[PDB]
């Protein structure tokens, strides 16, 4: 993985010494070649995970997420120099450095072999995101955002650390391959119940589960766009990925304690969706939609069914792409209006036809229009849940319904109407954002064409 | 402003007879019943007591609302019809035409030139019209929703540009 | 109640402004000036085959429209998808599957040559 790690690390000196004008160009292009190199990592052996070294390995679950992060890295670079144009060169270089360190930590996380190293980099993603959210944020509760986000993450992270070190003392090693091959049945002891809770609740905090999901409507809504997309697209996937890794040594106990959280998500995905309907801000609506989709992924994880795992992975990838695109579109409109209430600027479909389209298939993919990978990922989870329990369907059946409502509602109330007369700053569509939504959208349908890649390790 | 009794009965007659048109459908029925209702209205104009006249209006509105058409006719372009707000998807704000690329501008050259002179009208008229609305503002806050005139010569009447440059009835 | 001269002065002032703006909305003889464009010689030949005004020439202009339509829209599909079917799709098992045709008594099968044996007499009912 050092064919991807070493270039990512060496990307830091390039930006840190590039001229006052070349930082954006150089970072964008070289991150694009980094994504190209990581495109190779989609090469997967039939059943054996690709073990590059002792400390680094990859399989059909880590590789798609890694490719997602590496391909994403140019996208924040393209979305940031709009709101980062009027800044000192050193400050811009550090913003870029925060982004590269974030991507590097995500790569080491996804390619980590020992659970402790996975925890180290997984949590270590907090710091660059914290700096991005706090310093470069524009709204008020950004300072409150950082506190909420850090403390919510850590409150689950530390018990996970205690559980992992206890596992190391008892089992012998935290290596994934060992704990899977040398896996042993888990007894229904209450100490084992608390161990399962410690191993689960950190990822479920970052999932998020309903109830303890307040860090997203107070974090993604406030972060700069680059931070917002890197949060929603991948950082949410950290908990799902960790759960998929950890349920190997968390059975057969899970089912007995699967009952509270599963429905907590199942019911929660309704409320969040309902919360999406009666929203006032675009970014908050997208954040709550992300919460609902991630709750569906939670249900997929706790079913522990092959089909559930494949649908889960597909939903993570598709949701990352769709949420990043929706946040980018919201930023474009907000910057054009310097406000975020989704009533101030409506009826812009005529003014910006390409934005009107980009919003149209962004909503369609968010609404999971078949045969997009969003729809197949959702439907696989629906079928797995129905096999696990029939009634789930109606709740599932409710979700996209309400989702569809808001999935079109903002499009009705932001572009499908009459323009506001007193505003005039809406200029011609700068081709930067249009191109950015292109690099968002075309890979989505490309993966729709061949979903065997994002299908996960169960395929 | 305030709804005087004559206004409240003019609206009553309008609503009642348009609903009668929706009811009787055919034009000869509408003519007969409309003349009959015109008589039924003008027969008792001489209600001296304003309270009694308003009570008769109570009865008239009550019975009309009980018998108003369950599907009154509304013309399309008018509020409620099929062509209502159907042309909004075509009208574009005028200030967008300051955004056209120099190629787009030169491909429609003389219209941009006349927009330039209209813009000059707007600039030279803004200060004149703001001081005009200032001098004849109701002292200490505007009183009525009315709009102040261009009493002097050549001054563009205050608050004119958006009405003048309003998107046409048929932008297309 | 009410078209007062105070409000009149506004109304026909706005009238003459609005009208002159609408005269401005009217385009001009040079409008719309169109930037110069290259034209391929084949459509020069085709518009010269359209200028003469003859009936047969107009008819064959539109039938050549239909002919290029046929070759580039309804002939290249039967090219490519037949190439795909008979040599790629049909070459693999069960990709193309057809029900056995309804073989009635007294019918000859091509391969076997046998005529399916006839059935006993019909009840010879008549209305």
């Amino acid at each position: 993985m050092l064919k991807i790690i070493i270039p990512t690390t060496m990307l830091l000196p390039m930006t840190w010494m590039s001229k006052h004008n070349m930082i954006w160009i150089n970072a964008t292009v070289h991150s694009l070649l980094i994504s190209l190199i990581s495109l190779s990592l989609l090469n997967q052996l039939g059943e054996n995970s690709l073990n590059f070294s002792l400390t680094f390995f990859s399989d059909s679950l880590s590789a798609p997420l890694l490719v997602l992060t590496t391909w994403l890295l140019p996208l924040m670079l393209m979305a940031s120099q709009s709101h980062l144009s009027k800044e000192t060169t050193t400050r811009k270089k550090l913003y870029i450095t925060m982004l590269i360190l974030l991507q590097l930590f995500l790569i080491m996380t996804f390619t980590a072999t020992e659970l402790i190293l996975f925890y180290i980099l997984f949590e270590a993603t907090l710091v660059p995101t914290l700096i991005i959210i706090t310093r470069w944020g524009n709204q008020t509760e950004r300072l409150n955002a950082g506190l909420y986000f850090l403390f919510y993450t850590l409150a689950g992270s530390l018990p996970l650390l205690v559980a992992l070190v206890y596992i190391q003392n008892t089992t012998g090693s935290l290596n994934f391959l060992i704990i899977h091959y040398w896996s042993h049945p888990l007894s229904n002891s209450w100490s084992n119940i608390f161990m399962w809770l410690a191993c689960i609740m950190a990822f479920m905090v970052k999932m998020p589960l309903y109830g303890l999901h307040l860090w997203l409507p107070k974090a993604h809504v406030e972060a700069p766009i680059a931070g917002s997309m890197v949060l929603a697209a991948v950082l949410l996937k950290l908990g799902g990925y960790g759960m998929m890794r950890i349920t190997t040594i968390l059975n057969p106990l899970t089912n007995y304690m699967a009952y509270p959280f599963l429905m907590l998500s199942m019911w929660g995905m309704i409320m969040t969706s309902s919360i999406c309907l009666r929203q006032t801000d675009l970014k908050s609506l997208i954040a709550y939609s992300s919460v609902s989709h991630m709750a569906l992924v939670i249900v997929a994880i706790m079913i522990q069914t092959p089909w559930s795992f494949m649908g889960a992975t597909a939903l993570m990838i598709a949701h990352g792409l769709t949420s990043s695109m929706l946040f980018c579109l919201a930023n474009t409109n907000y910057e054009r209006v310097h406000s975020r209430t989704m009533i101030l600027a409506r009826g812009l479909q005529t003014l910006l036809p390409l934005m009107a389209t980009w919003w149209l298939m962004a909503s369609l993919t968010n609404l999971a229009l078949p045969p997009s990978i969003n729809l197949i990922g959702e439907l696989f989870i629906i079928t797995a849940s129905f096999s696990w329990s029939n009634i789930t369907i109606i709740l599932m059946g409710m979700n996209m319904m309400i989702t569809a409502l808001y999935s079109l509602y903002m499009l009705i109330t932001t572009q499908r109407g009459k323009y506001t007369h007193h505003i005039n700053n809406i200029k011609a569509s700068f081709t930067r954002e249009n191109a950015l939504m292109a690099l968002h959208i075309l890979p989505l349908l490309l993966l729709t064409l061949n979903p065997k890649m994002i299908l996960g390790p169960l395929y | 402003a305030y709804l005087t009794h004559q206004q409240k009965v003019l609206r009553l007659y309008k609503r009642a007879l348009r609903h009668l048109e929706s009811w009787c459908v055919h034009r000869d029925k509408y003519r007969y019943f409309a003349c009959l209702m015109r008589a039924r209205f003008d027969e008792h104009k001489n209600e001296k007591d304003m309270v009694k006249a308003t009570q008769l209006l109570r009865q008239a509105e009550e019975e009309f609302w009980y018998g108003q058409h369950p599907q009154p006719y509304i013309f399309p372009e008018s509020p409620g019809g099929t062509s209502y707000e159907r042309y909004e998807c075509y009208k574009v704000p005028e200030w967008c035409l300051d955004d056209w690329h120099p190629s787009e501008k030169a491909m429609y050259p003389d219209y941009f030139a006349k927009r330039e002179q209209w813009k000059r009208l707007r600039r030279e008229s803004w200060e004149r019209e703001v001081k005009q609305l200032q001098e004849e503002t109701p002292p200490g806050g505007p009183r009525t929703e009315a709009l102040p005139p261009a009493r002097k010569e050549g001054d563009l009447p205050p608050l004119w540009w958006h009405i003048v440059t309003r998107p046409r009835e048929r932008p297309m | 109640s009410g078209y007062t001269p105070d409000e009149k002065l506004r109304l026909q002032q706005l009238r003459e402004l609005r009208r002159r703006w609408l005269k401005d909305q009217e385009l001009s003889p040079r409008e719309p000036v169109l930037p110069p464009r290259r034209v391929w010689p084949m459509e020069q030949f085709w518009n010269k085959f359209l200028q003469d005004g003859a009936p047969w020439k107009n008819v064959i202009y539109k039938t050549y429209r239909h002919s290029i339509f046929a070759v580039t829209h309804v002939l290249i599909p039967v090219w490519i998808i037949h190439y795909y079917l008979k040599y790629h799709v049909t070459a693999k098992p069960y990709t193309v599957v057809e029900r056995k045709p309804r073989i009635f008594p007294g019918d000859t099968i091509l391969e076997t040559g046998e005529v399916i044996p006839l059935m006993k007499e019909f009840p010879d009912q008549h209305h």
């Binding site: 005529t350 011609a428 | 574009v92 690329h101 787009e104 429609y108 046409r168 048929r170 | 385009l27």
Partner: peptide, 12 residues
């Protein structure tokens, strides 16, 4: 008689 067409700038 053809009136003016007020459209967003489609060049970009």
């Amino acid at each position: 008689k053809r009136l003016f067409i007020i459209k967003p700038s489609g060049f970009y």
